[PDB]
């Protein structure tokens, strides 16, 4: 999950409480981790009419 808000306190894990056979576990962090990405090559754009 990226660019979103952070949890006010500690990490909160949200889940369903009926059965343990669940589809999604959502982990909401209280601190962000920065990720840096790049595509290092340089492309020329062309155009075909």
């Amino acid at each position, epitope marked *: 999950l990226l660019n979103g808000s952070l949890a006010e306190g500690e990490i909160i894990i949200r889940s*369903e409480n*009926i*059965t*343990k*056979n*669940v*589809k*999604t576990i959502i982990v909401h962090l209280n601190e962000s981790v920065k990720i840096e990405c790049t595509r290092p090559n340089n492309k020329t754009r062309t155009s075909i009419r």
Partner: antibody
Amino acid sequence: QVQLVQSGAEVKKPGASVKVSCKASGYTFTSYYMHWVRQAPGQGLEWMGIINPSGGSTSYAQKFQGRVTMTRDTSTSTVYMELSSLRSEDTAVYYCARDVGTEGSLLHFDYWGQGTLVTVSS
Amino acid sequence: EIVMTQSPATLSVSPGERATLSCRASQSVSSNLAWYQQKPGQAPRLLIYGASTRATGIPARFSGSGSGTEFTLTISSLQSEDFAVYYCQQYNNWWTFGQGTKVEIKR
């Protein structure tokens, strides 16, 4: 009009592979999970695995881990199961069924296919 | 691993009498038990879900009650068409089934 359709299968030699499948309709294919189960005459029921046709990923019981694989095709509304390294221990009737729940967790179901046989013999 | 068993393996019922079967678990599966009916030669159908709720299409003669580690199924006025193999299933953890029991006609 929810229906499940299965093909039959032959008797294979030990070490051989088999492919079985199930087609289903009356409900959007990508909106639900599908299960495969196994039972042999004189035995009880076992769960083999689950496939999510929406994407997608699979999960299997450790019992068949490394021997069972599953795929899906959303253009035909079908799921496929394949078993490698067949042994006489796998002689059984295989079933395919639709799961229940879109809400966040899964429970269980009432739409079952007919049952297809796979046998293994020398 | 959720361990489920059933008793009696075979029940003998005089048609027209009510019949009972029960299931036991080694763990707590209290939020979600279910029962299924298997016809010889045909795919099974769901009868009870949510521990005690009747599945849609199931006649009032089919009922049951329980929670936790124990549950009993009852069929009022068991009819000849109701002699079948019955199974218990747990939804509180990775799905498993019990061995199953069968009801035979008393003669």
